[PDB]
Amino acid sequence: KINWEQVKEWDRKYLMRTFSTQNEYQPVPIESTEGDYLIMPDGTRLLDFFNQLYCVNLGQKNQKVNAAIKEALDRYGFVWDTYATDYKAKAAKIIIEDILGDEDWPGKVRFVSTGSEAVETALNIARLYTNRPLVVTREHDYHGWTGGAATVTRLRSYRSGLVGENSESFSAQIPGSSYNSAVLMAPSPNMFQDSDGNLLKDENGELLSVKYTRRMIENYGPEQVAAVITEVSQGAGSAMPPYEYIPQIRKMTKELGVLWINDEVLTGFGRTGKWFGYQHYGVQPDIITMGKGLSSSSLPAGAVLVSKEIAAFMDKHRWESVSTYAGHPVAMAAVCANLEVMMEENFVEQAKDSGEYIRSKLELLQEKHKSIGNFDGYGLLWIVDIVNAKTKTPYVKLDRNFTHGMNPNQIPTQIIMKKALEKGVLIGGVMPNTMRIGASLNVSRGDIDKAMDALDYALDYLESGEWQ
Amino acid sequence: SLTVQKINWEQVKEWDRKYLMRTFSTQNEYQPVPIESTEGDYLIMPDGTRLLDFFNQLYCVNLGQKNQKVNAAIKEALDRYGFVWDTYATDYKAKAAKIIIEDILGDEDWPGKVRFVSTGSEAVETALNIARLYTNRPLVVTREHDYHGWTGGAATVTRLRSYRSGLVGENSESFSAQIPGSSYNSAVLMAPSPNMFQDSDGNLLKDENGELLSVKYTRRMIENYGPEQVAAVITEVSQGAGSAMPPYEYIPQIRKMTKELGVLWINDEVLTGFGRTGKWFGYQHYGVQPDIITMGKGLSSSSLPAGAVLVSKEIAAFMDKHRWESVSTYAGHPVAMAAVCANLEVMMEENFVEQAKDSGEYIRSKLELLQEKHKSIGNFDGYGLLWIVDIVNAKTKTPYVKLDRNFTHGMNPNQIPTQIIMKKALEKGVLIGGVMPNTMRIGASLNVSRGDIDKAMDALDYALDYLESGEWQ
Amino acid sequence: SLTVQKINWEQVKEWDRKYLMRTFSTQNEYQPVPIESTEGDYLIMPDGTRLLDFFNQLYCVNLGQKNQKVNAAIKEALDRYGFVWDTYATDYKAKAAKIIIEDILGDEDWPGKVRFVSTGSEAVETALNIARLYTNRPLVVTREHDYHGWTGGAATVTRLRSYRSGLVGENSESFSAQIPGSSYNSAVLMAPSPNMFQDSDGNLLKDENGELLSVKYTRRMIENYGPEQVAAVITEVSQGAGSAMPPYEYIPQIRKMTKELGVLWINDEVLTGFGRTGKWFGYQHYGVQPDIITMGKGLSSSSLPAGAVLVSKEIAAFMDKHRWESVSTYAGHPVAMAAVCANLEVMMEENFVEQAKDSGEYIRSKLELLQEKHKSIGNFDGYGLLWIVDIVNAKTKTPYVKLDRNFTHGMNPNQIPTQIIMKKALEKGVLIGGVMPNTMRIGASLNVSRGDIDKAMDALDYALDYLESGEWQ
Amino acid sequence: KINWEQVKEWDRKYLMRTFSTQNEYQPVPIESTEGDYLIMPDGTRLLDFFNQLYCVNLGQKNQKVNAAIKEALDRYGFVWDTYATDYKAKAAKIIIEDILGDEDWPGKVRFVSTGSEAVETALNIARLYTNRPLVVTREHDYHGWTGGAATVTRLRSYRSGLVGENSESFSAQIPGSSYNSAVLMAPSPNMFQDSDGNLLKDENGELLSVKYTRRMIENYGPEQVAAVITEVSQGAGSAMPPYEYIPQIRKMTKELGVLWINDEVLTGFGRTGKWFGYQHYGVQPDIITMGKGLSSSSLPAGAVLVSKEIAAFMDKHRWESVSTYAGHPVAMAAVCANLEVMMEENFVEQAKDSGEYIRSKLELLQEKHKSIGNFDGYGLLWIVDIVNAKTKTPYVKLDRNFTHGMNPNQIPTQIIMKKALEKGVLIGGVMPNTMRIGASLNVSRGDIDKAMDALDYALDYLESGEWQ
Ligand SMILES: *Cc1c(COP(=O)(O)O)cnc(C)c1O
Ligand SMILES: *Cc1c(COP(=O)(O)O)cnc(C)c1O
Ligand SMILES: *Cc1c(COP(=O)(O)O)cnc(C)c1O
Ligand SMILES: *Cc1c(COP(=O)(O)O)cnc(C)c1O
């Protein structure tokens, strides 16, 4: 038995708030989860088409994963990274040999506890390998929240600052940590479009976003630029690049002698209907970062994978880095089980096929709803651009440069979410004009149908315009 | 089942060699140390070798290895979860916060609100962010030899040269490579270590008004840079990795100085927290209360990854008035919180703090005896299950390694006293030694037995015989 | 009776080689170029060789070399001074500020107060300090290829790769070194140059709303970083060292964008100031008024070292309410201020600004004729005595040096078209060329004669003949 | 005919204020100068025992210097640093061959226009030569005001910030420029003494301030520290180090492989009764910076002098640095004439002898005035430590960490200055509890007597409490 009234009391009183003021806050108790559902203490079932934070890839509370964790708990315990375990070694082997066995780039893995820690590690390694300070990121990128990872996060609304309650006159950024001269922000891949929706290219066929990135690196000196960090689909920032963007970035970093880090924390492990997001583009990175679907959130884990060449350099030195929980044997047992289930049950193909189905459903919704400007994605990771049906332009002018100071009653994705909730479906987004949709890789056709029906309903309400 | 061999450890060793990034060792020198299972204060190797761990890993398995009540509690949580992120409420997350604030610190008035994260470094990142936002000021003051974590923000306040995630050579001190760009935008002042400013008679120096010179100089730095731009002073009451104990008055004087200057005091309890020092928290030895503490390690006794920051009522009331745009995927992970809950409940119910206090007194008496027969023990200090032992050359009474806490791991371990001691102790099936070259750093579980303490001290005895013989050099 | 000036010029050259630090040249490639005296647009060597200077040194001797009225005025001030620092008042310092505000800019309401310093870089340092203090915000936005000076603060906003006080190799672009540590703490964003987004015809790209793409992305960057932490955008209306002219619409769009975002606009007039462009200031071509300008060069026409910053009435009123703890020894130097006063008085009385406009129109007609005869001229643009000429391969109409304004001085000058032009024109006793590899940057005194313009254009004619006669390749 | 009332009106209206609010500001017009005197429009003569900013070493309006400037103006004009002149080359030769002819360290000079610019250049060269970023400065050092030079200025009251009018209700440091991680602040010399004034030395005889500086460099890594920058007597910061401090810094930097930059902008050119301040200490630096006495403020000039080995390194590269007015030939003619006069008329020995006389005068004042706690100095550069006689402690607690937000009616050096002005003498200090006395190197015994008499009168007043 649980006193949920007491839980709510303690949650209100003793926990720090995020995104909501204490004034406006209402706790949202979840007593248990299963598959694509969250279950409230009263038994209310919610179909979660956020997949929490696009991170419960295998499905909620997988029985084989949970059984694997229980077995680990018969032996461990805790040992730190200086000590070797079967679970930690096997996890690395599964990634390099089993998942990426068809590719030549992978060298060595370091496990840590979170995706932000993975990005911190990737940044440190890239800089040490090149012996150079600068890293290039893009407008709207999200790469985590800790001090180093945040420097490459250029998503205004997710930088751990403070904003006001329904007033945008009160932005307070973290003093001493609100900009960083060791990072250059390049344009979003989506920045250079003409009035007809056509892509701008230079006379050599290079996308203008890539050409501008090249020029920034030339100006600062390629000799001081360690790496370009990307997301193949911006996750929190909610965007899909032109197809040619990632291949051209791979080519340009090669030409300039700069590393390419692709952040796979969100796109990794089947999320996009391939093992990794980069694999849609016929290229290979120098470093990837991992989290979320690495363990499908069963326990906290993150990881960095570096190329053979980078691993060979690191192997020649003593690296003076310690993280207490890095390599935690029970977390690694969860990772092994998660990856074994994904492989054995062909979760990646399930994702590919289900994305193809989602594409079909969104096509039909776009024909019925003029507030849908476009949609794109793959696997279980979709964006839907929301516009005013009458003007065909976004409702929120600041768009991906908005802050959470905004009243949610002015925000289309918040209006959509609140309405879809009436049908027992959690669906919406994190940007104001852009849906961000994701479920478990093994989500059923019936649950996709139920989600799309709730979205159908929310879009009817949005287009009625009676919220205004 | 028909299986008689669940794990092929030869295969594990090859994978570990081939596929895992090294730390502290080059690939060429690396000798893997596989651990198949743990229990209490013991690690068990796949060949059955049992090692008594007087490092308690990283001074972080406070409850003991593989506590059966904690592991059962984790298994129970797995009937229900699953994963929800911090926007959702769970019983385990809310109860964890309540145990800290109401139960453990119910006698204190400063505590306000907790944010849970996954590691001690993430806790420190969070504390720094909050201190800077609350004060609207950028600078944080740390101390020489402090260790506060490894991630970009936490590392800015880490001034322990050998633990800043840089690269050093294999038995050569000539190839230091620090991470390029890592101090761009750092907003940090390094104040003196507490143990700076000693006289030849070993006493810590004070001014005419009795202010320690370490504190007086910290005050001068804050005045010089402008108190109006200094958010916080961050401390460890006992430097963990840095391996130092401050004079008794240092922590009280830092509380006084920060109050007088209008600056916050963050005490980093990631290592000293949860009974490590024979009180619930390290700061409680000093009769003062901080504005913010950071936690990890003993928070879950390493059962699952957890960290936390606890802020004062004043700070929590401020943060409550704003929308805080900060997200961490695993922050508040319900299964991790179930582990914290169980760890803390066992700790409370079985009086682990008093067990630590009592065993510390017993350790003190064993070290007294060791100092009487070993001139290589210059001095020792500590409390609960956290001890430093200053090692010196018995004939000169001066440390062997000149750079001391400013050493790097570029050094050959065959020249390092704490490495010599460790290597010899292992012959007795005991892991004991330290992080710094001239200083032992000793810890075990809070419920460690008297027999296990005796076993470890006998091993140290044997190791010191060998150091003092000078056969190693 | 005749007191001959005792100068051994071979000894001077020896001393210059041995005792003075080199810039732009290695010691081994360096040959000193002694100049004994100057007059009007001419440099005179010790042997009496005369050189017509169509660089006007650094586009900075606006009034002409060794103007008798200015020099008499300096000699007069030396009857009285001496030196006093800025806490003391003099007639010369107060008059210089009055001339700028009430006699030059009396037709505009923005000007408030001046601070005099000794150099253009010092003026930019001061402007950055004031913009940040007034707004209480850290970030300043500059543009790719801007040059704003060389001192630590001014260099942060200089994004001209080849002019940031680093080291490059001798005819090798593989060994170089930027100054370590110089960008720790820098609070600067680099926005696109005004010329960055062009089409095949040469038109600058605009969005459907009519906003230049360069401006659009500048605004996006400010939005992303938070307009609440952006103090200012700093610009040059014509990139001086960077050698570029904006589309007419850029500056009005920047003025509008800054007003809309609540950000200051600093226009750097150190090069374009004081008649250089055929108006008093470069910004005056664009129908707008800035919040702050920086001055140097033509401020005194290099007669003595002076720089200045002029801030708006609203900025001045804010600064006036506080005690500003800033001192510079030579700021307001009374004899340098005497030079400024006389330079400006001569410029006004003899209508040099009007003379410069007229001569620019003349130069325009001369360049038109050169372009019709020389296919190596792709385009040219300018005003007054500041001209850019885009140099291209005559057959392709595209530039020879691909890195263009991102080149370094590591390049061999026998590969740089502007170096080739300079070397050839020298045979005709004319100094003319550029700072960037594909772009001429032409300037003389505001009172340059038609005969000297004709002589310079003749030498260029000769130079371009040789460039497009495939012999240098 | 000059209209000085109109001058005062223009000065108030059109010039930015420093140290004073507009509201409290009273302009102080100076019509001419001569020797150690400033002359007001009404003929009032003021004996200047600040020597402006300790920078008019030769005396005001030296006729030989002014004649030399006039001669240069018959030839120039302006050429920038790429061209050679007799004046620029001769100035460098005078410094290296004539003044420093007895020393082996000097290599090459770069002339610039100000002391701050000299410091900027020195920092750049030290960092390029070593290929290292960090520079160590000391608490209370003043090394100039420009962005780079200001990073090593750790004098709280002189960092180009804003403070209030007789209040603490408004205070503001420059955003983005109020600290710098590429600089480490080491302790001031005399860091801590024991209660009897004994210097704290370790078992190797190393002073505490030096030992701690060494520890900082070890902690940050000597491989990343370019230089230690010092003033042998802190000028604005108003302090004299123990004799052994500078020698031990020279020794320590050599042992650690770190450069020593000694900032001679204020102590240079006879100020201390030697050609350079460092010459009191039997050591040679790697780099010095120069200004002030370099031209005795006749025209703006600064300079950096680097060692033979540093010069040999820079000579191998193309250095992409331009400063328009660096090497200005008329400024260089002034430097030449200034240094020639100093040499020919033995101004350095004049300074030394007058320093000895000043010492005897201050000894007599201390016998008579218990508000004089101590005094020290050399040549024409002195400090006098002022204390409340009845408590034996300084009146202003914050001491060298004060700000100009204080009311000047509470500041001992302000009270002294105001009373001394009744005798037509300008004398006082920069810091609240410390006199900073300087005059021209050729100041007469009669003027020293007049200044000391005015100080005696001022100290009677201070000790009377009547100001309080
Ligand atoms: C969520 C995320 C991170 C950070 O992961 P955490 O586990 O939340 O620290 C980093 N990068 C990307 C692309 C992400 O989506
Ligand atoms: C170990 C430690 C940390 C960092 O904790 P991790 O969980 O290793 O990130 C922070 N502070 C102190 C005092 C520590 O001992
Ligand atoms: C020359 C120049 C400066 C710097 O002036 P200095 O007197 O050389 O310090 C600054 N801004 C611009 C636009 C310049 O052309
Ligand atoms: C005055 C001074 C400077 C700066 O000189 P300016 O000419 O005022 O720029 C630098 N260092 C010291 C020690 C000084 O006294």
Neighbours of B29 (CB within 10 A): 12
> Closest Cα to residue D112, out of D266, D294, D271, D339?
D294
Neighbours of D2 (CB within 10 A): 14
> Closest Cα to residue C233, out of C281, C179, C189?
C189
Q: Which helix (H) or strand (E) holds D37?
A: strand D37-39
Contacts of A203 in chain C (CB under 8 A): 200
Q: Where are the alpha helices (DSSP H) in D322-444?
A: 329-344, 347-368, 412-420
State phi, psi for D440 to the nearest 5 degrees. -70, 155
Contacts of D255 (CB under 8 A, 6+ apart): none
Coil, strand, or helix at residue C372?
helix
Burial track B276-291 (b if 16+ CB lie within 10 A, e otherwise): bbbbbbbbbbbebbbb
Q: Which residue type, as a one-letter code, is found at position C11?
A: Q
A381 to each of A53, A100, A102, A377, how far by Cα in Å? 11, 21, 24, 6
Secondary structure of B116-180 as H, E, C letters: EECCHHHHHHHHHHHHHHHHCCCEEEEECCCCCCCCHHHHHCCCCHHHCCCEECCCCCCCCECCC
> Closest Cα of chain B to A224: distance in Å?
10
Q: Does C24 touch chain B (CB under 8 A)?
A: no
Contacts of D200 (CB under 8 A, 6+ apart): B205, D191, D192, D193, D194, D207, D208
- Which is it for the CA torsion C357, C362, C368, C371, positive or negative? negative
Determine the residue of chain D that is closest to B182 in CA distance: D181
Contacts of B65 (CB under 8 A, 6+ apart): A76, A77, A78, B38, B39, B40, B41, B42, B43, B53, B445
> Closest Cα of chain B to D214: distance in Å?
11
Distance CA C356, CA A358 (A): 68
Q: What is the DSSP letter of D410?
A: G
> Closest Cα to residue D245, out of D259, D234, D258?
D234
> Closest Cα to residue B325, out of B88, B129, B161?
B129
C300 CA → ligand 3 middle, Å: 13
What does R_g of chain C's alpha carbons equal in angstroms? 22
Q: Is B147 in the pocket of ligand 2 (CB under 6 A)?
A: yes
Q: Which atom, in ligand 4's list, is nearest to the CA of C329?
A: 8
Say which of C161, C197, C228 has its CB closest to residue A171.
C228
Q: What is the dihedral of CA B274, B275, B281, B282, to 10 degrees?
A: -130
D298 CA → ligand 4 middle, Å: 15
State phi, psi for D109 to the nearest 5 degrees. -110, 145
Q: Is D358 in the pocket of ligand 4 (CB under 6 A)?
A: no
Q: How many residues does chain A have?
A: 468
Tell me which CATH code domain B67-350 carries: 3.40.640.10
Residue nearest to atom 5 of ligand 2 (CA): B120
CB A36 within 8 A of CB A443: yes
CB B73 within 8 A of CB B100: no
Q: Which helix (H) or strand (E) holds B379?
A: strand B377-383
Cis before D77? omega within 30: yes
Residue with tokens 């101004």: D347
Q: Which helix (H) or strand (E) holds B266?
A: strand B264-268
Distance CA D237, CA D152 (A): 13
Distance CA B147, CA A322 (A): 11
C7's tokens: 């100068």
Q: Does B343 touch chain A (CB under 8 A)?
A: no
Q: Which helix (H) or strand (E) holds D455?
A: helix D445-464
Q: Does C260 touch chain A (CB under 8 A)?
A: no
CB A386 within 8 A of CB A371: yes
Secondary structure of B73-98 as H, E, C letters: HHHHHCCCCCCCCCCCECHHHHHHHH
Q: Which atom, in ligand 3's list, is nearest to the CA of C154?
A: 10
CB A264 within 8 A of CB A277: yes
Q: Which CATH architecture has domain A62-345?
A: 3-Layer(aba) Sandwich (3.40)
**In degrees, to the nearest 5, what angle opens at C-alpha B206 toward C-alphas B201 and B211?**
155
Contacts of C380 (CB under 8 A, 6+ apart): C367, C371, C387, C388, C389, C390
Distance CA D149, CA B13 (A): 55
Distance CA D442, CA D353 (A): 10
What does R_g of chain B's alpha carbons equal in angstroms? 22
CB C224 within 8 A of CB A139: yes
Rama region for B123: left / alpha / beta (φ>0; ψ in -120 to 50; rest): alpha
Cβ pair D185:B186 closer than 8 A: no
Pocket test for ligand 4, best of C117, C126, C329 (most atoms within 8 A of CB): C329
Q: Is B309 in the pocket of ligand 2 (CB under 6 A)?
A: no
CB C29 within 8 A of CB C50: no
Coil, strand, or helix at residue C35?
coil
Chain D, window 300-339: residues with a beta carbon less than 8 angstroms from a chain C beta carbon: 300, 304, 306, 311, 314-325, 327-328, 330-331
Q: Where are the domains of chain B?
A: 1-66+351-473, 67-350
State phi, psi for D346 to the nearest 5 degrees. 50, 50
Q: Does B136 touch chain C (CB under 8 A)?
A: no
Cβ pair C325:D157 closer than 8 A: yes
D457: exposed, middle or buried (Cβ count in 10 Å: 0-12, 13-18, 19+): middle
Q: Starting at the edge strand that comes first in sequence, how are the strands of the sheet with B377-383 ordered? A: B377-383, B386-391, B439-442
Say which of C24, C57, C140 has its CB closest to residue D78.
C57
Q: What is the resolution of this structure in A?
A: 1.7
Q: Which residue type, as a one-letter code, is found at position A153?
A: T
Site from C185, C186, C229 to mutate, B interface, most B CB atoms within 10 angstroms: C185
B119's tokens: 């590691």
C317 CA → ligand 4 middle, Å: 28
Q: What is the dihedral of CA A96, A97, A103, A109, to 10 degrees?
A: 10
Q: Which helix (H) or strand (E) holds C76?
A: helix C68-77
Parallel, antiparallel, or unpaired: how do β-strands A225-230 and A259-263 relate? Answer: parallel
Q: Which atom, in ligand 3's list, is nearest to the CA of C236?
A: 13
Q: Which atom, in ligand 3's list, is nearest to the CA of C121?
A: 9
Coil, strand, or helix at residue D375?
strand
Residues with beta carbon inside 6 Å of ligand 1?
A: A 114-116, 119, 142-144, 231, 235, 263, 265-266, 291, 302; B 328-330
User: Is C1-66+351-473 CATH 3.40.50.720?
Assistant: no
Neighbours of C7 (CB within 10 A): 15
> Closest Cα to residue A152, out of A229, A260, A250?
A229
State phi, psi for D186 to the nearest 5 degrees. -85, 165
Q: What is the DSSP letter of D114?
A: S
Distance CA C437, CA C399 (A): 9
What does R_g of chain D's alpha carbons equal in angstroms? 22
Contacts of A318 in chain B (CB under 8 A): 22, 24-26, 167-170, 409-410
Cα of first residue to Cα of last residue in chain A, in angstroms, is: 44
Distance CA B455, CA B452 (A): 5
Coil, strand, or helix at residue B198?
strand
Say which of B87, B100, B231 has its CB closest to residue A19.
B87
Q: Where are the alpha helices (DSSP H) in B275-416?
A: 313-319, 334-349, 352-373
Instruction: Give D280's Cβ-side CA count (13 Å radius).
Output: 26
Distance CA C305, CA C120 (A): 9
Q: Does D221 touch chain C (CB under 8 A)?
A: no
C304 CA → ligand 3 middle, Å: 15
D43's tokens: 């003929």
Q: Does A216 touch chain C (CB under 8 A)?
A: yes
> Closest Cα of chain C to B184: distance in Å?
4
Residue nearest to atom 11 of ligand 2 (CA): B148
- Which is it for the CA torsion C12, C17, C23, C26, positive or negative? positive
Residue with tokens 């096997």: A90
Secondary structure of chain A as H, E, C letters: CCCHHHHHHHHHHHECCCCCCCCCCCCCECCEEEECEEECCCCCEEEECCHHHHCCCCCECCHHHHHHHHHHCCCCCCCCCCCECHHHHHHHHHHHHHHCCCCCCEEEEEEECCHHHHHHHHHHHHHHHHCCCEEEEECCCCCCCCHHHHHCCCCHHHCCCEECCCCCCCCECCCCCCCCCCEEEECCCCCCECCCCCECECCCCCEHHHHHHHHHHHHHCHHHEEEEEECCCECCCCECCCCCHHHHHHHHHHHHCCEEEEECCCCCCCCCCCCCHHHHCCCCCCEEEECHHHCCCCCCCEEEEEEHHHHHHHCCCEECCCCCCCCCHHHHHHHHHHHHHHHHCCHHHHHHHHHHHHHHHHHHHHHHCCCEEEEEEECCEEEEEECCCCCCCCCCCCHHHCCCCCCHHHCHHHHHHHHHHCCCEECCCCECCEEEECCCCCCCHHHHHHHHHHHHHHHHHHHHCCCC
Q: Starting at the edge strand that comes first in sequence, how are the strands of the sheet with A37-39 ordered? A: A32-34, A37-39, A45-48, A425-426
How many helices (H) and strands (E) chain D has is answered by 13, 17
> Closest Cα of chain C to A465: distance in Å?
26
CB A121 within 8 A of CB A93: no
- The CATH fold assigned to A1-61+346-468 is Aspartate Aminotransferase, domain 1 (3.90.1150)
Distance CA C323, CA D29 (A): 20
A215's tokens: 């020029």
> Closest Cα of chain D to B269: distance in Å?
23
State phi, psi for B470 to the nearest 5 degrees. 70, 20
Q: Which residue type, as a one-letter code, is found at position A108?
A: K
Distance CA D247, CA D280 (A): 10
